[PDB]
Amino acid sequence: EVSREQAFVRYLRQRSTPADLARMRRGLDAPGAEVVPLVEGFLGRIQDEHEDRWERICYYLVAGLWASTVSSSELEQFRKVNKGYRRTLGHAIAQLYLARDQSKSIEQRFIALLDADEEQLPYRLRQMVQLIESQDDIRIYWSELLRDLLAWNRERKPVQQKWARAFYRTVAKEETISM
Ligand SMILES: [Hg+2]
Ligand SMILES: [Hg+2]
């Protein structure tokens, strides 16, 4: 059923107050450093012995980005193999890429994103989400985003692999949808 990242996002949707969102937003430059009881509560109900500074950064970052959203797709998320890829940020980014005439600068910004280390990531992701949110119609699956960020430092780099494949798979798909 409901994975922990799903549960997390549901909880933010159901329980956040406007004050929480203000804090979540404010913490964007140093996620975790701006404490939000709501989030702390959720992390304090699992973490145990994973002083995982990463986890805390990822949760808080997703909170902040989510708390910043403007997408029409989030207005829907209040009512409600291939599925794998569409649900990843790679797919969202490709959609943005195609919306802007297959713009090489998005592709580059995207490659740069896949190169990020832990320190670079919160910043580059924040810029990309921002770009994505400029297009009205593109959904970002937050729970998948969080799961993916959590696994960023895995060894043969599966998330980054996964994203890349989603991106080029979507682009290719469009070159077929057109005839
Ligand atoms: Hg992160
Ligand atoms: Hg979601």
Domain range annotation of the chain: 1-179
Cα 10 to ligand 2 centroid, rounded to whole Å: 8
Name which of 122, 90, 128 is nearest 109 in CA terms: 128
Name which of 99, 95, 94, 98 is nearest 111 in CA terms: 94
Expressed in percent and rounded to 5, the helix, strand and coil fractions of the chain are 70, 0, 30
For the domain with range 1-179, which CATH number is right: 1.20.1250.20, 1.10.520.40, 3.40.309.10, 1.20.1090.10? 1.10.520.40
Resolution for this experimental structure (Å): 2.8
Cα 105 to ligand 2 centroid, rounded to whole Å: 27
Cα 170 to ligand 2 centroid, rounded to whole Å: 20
Collapsing DSSP states into helix, strand and coil, what is residue 22?
helix
What is the Cα–Cα distance from 109 to 97, expressed in whole angstroms? 10
